[PDB]
């Protein structure tokens, strides 16, 4: 599993893989690792799938109730606080959850909060979580800039996921892309890892150690 999210002048880029494993056998390669909490907020998935799905859907319900009560769009800090307080109430029970909550508000701008099942809640710029986080983070560090255009940022996210999926056995399948702006999140598609590898090798000249 590899998930990543970063901020830039255009907003937020979120890129995930789609492989799930149960040991050596690949249970699925069509897993959706981005939770669509609401048309303005996104949440990544890592650790336990059921915990992430259930509690981020519950978080969407809570954000809706907040917007009904206060007649304003909730803050990303407040939603991440709600999720972190809830998971802290369960500390020691056995929940497994490491997620990135990504949003874009008028007052805060683009904002990413990493929330863990241990109660951790960190505001950040670049996050990479999973068994293949090292390669993807290396790519992002080598190529991150604040003034990246939307196309360059999407390509960078895809390239980082591809680099992680090539080396990590428990990572791969396909790449799901998302762009988060002020008006909401835009889905930029699913890209098969196998075809993407050959296309990238041809266009860049990389992976010379692999016979094509």
């Amino acid at each position: 599993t590899t998930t990543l999210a970063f901020r830039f002048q255009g907003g937020i880029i979120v890129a995930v893989d789609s492989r799930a494993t149960a040991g050596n056998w690949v249970a699925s390669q069509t897993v959706k690792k981005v939770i669509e909490i609401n048309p303005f907020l996104l949440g990544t998935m890592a650790g336990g799938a059921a915990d992430c799905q259930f509690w981020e859907t519950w978080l969407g319900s809570q954000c809706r109730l907040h917007e009904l009560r206060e007649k304003e769009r909730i803050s990303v800090a407040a939603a991440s606080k709600i999720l972190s307080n809830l998971v802290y109430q369960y500390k020691g029970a056995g929940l497994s959850m490491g997620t990135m909550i990504c949003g874009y508000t008028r007052k805060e701008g683009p904002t990413i909060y990493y929330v863990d099942s241990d109660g951790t809640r960190l505001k950040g710029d670049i996050f990479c979580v999973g068994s293949g986080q090292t390669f993807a983070y290396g790519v992002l560090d080598s190529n991150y800039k604040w003034d990246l255009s939307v196309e360059d940022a999407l390509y960078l996210g895809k390239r980082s996921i591809l680099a992680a999926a090539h080396r990590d056995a428990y990572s791969g399948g396909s790449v799901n892309l998302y762009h988060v702006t002020e008006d909401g999140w835009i889905y930029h598609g699913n890209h098969d890892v196998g075809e993407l590898f050959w296309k990238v090798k041809e266009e860049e000249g990389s992976f010379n150690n692999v016979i094509g």
């Binding site: 056998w25 699925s28 069509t30 799938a49 059921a50 799905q53 259930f54 029970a93 056995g94």
Partner: protein, 222 residues
Amino acid sequence: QFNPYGDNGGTILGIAGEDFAVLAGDTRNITDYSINSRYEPKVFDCGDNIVMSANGFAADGDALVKRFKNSVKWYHFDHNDKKLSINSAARNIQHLLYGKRFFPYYVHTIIAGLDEDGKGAVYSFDPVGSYEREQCRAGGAAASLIMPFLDNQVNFKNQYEPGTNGKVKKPLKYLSVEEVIKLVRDSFTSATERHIQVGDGLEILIVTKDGVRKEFYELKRD
């Protein structure tokens, strides 16, 4: 030191078509190496043209099926006999499963039916409660044997056009229900050949806009 759980074996498979859905299951029930029964169905029609199968520990699966049927009954009572769609049933089952997060049902669940656009739909549930909509999904003892074959034959994986030097993949086509039935029968016969816990019989439920119909075939009893 009590071990409230068991295994019970079994193998189920769900496939979604263009305008139909199929849920097939083995009918063999075993404890460790003895046969409890050769005909014990594990695929049920839970109203509103929705079929369900919870494979694994038999007691937990039966309890979950009973609870879901009761949930359908109360949904009809509380909402003026409104039809329960397939996505709503999937969400309700997720909540039913997560209600036992720290003492879970030890089952893998698959449901099948038609969506609101008339297309086939299959949903898969892990024991904890996470679910997803998939085109093809096998579960149980012989899932690892069945799944690659369906990857090759349904999705045409690793198949190319003969003459394009592997540059054009074999295009996908919409299978008919008869072709799906043949694929299911072949998969289960292969599983019976190689897996000890699979055999005796196979029961298939097919859901279309006209309702749910059942077919039965015999598998090798050994």
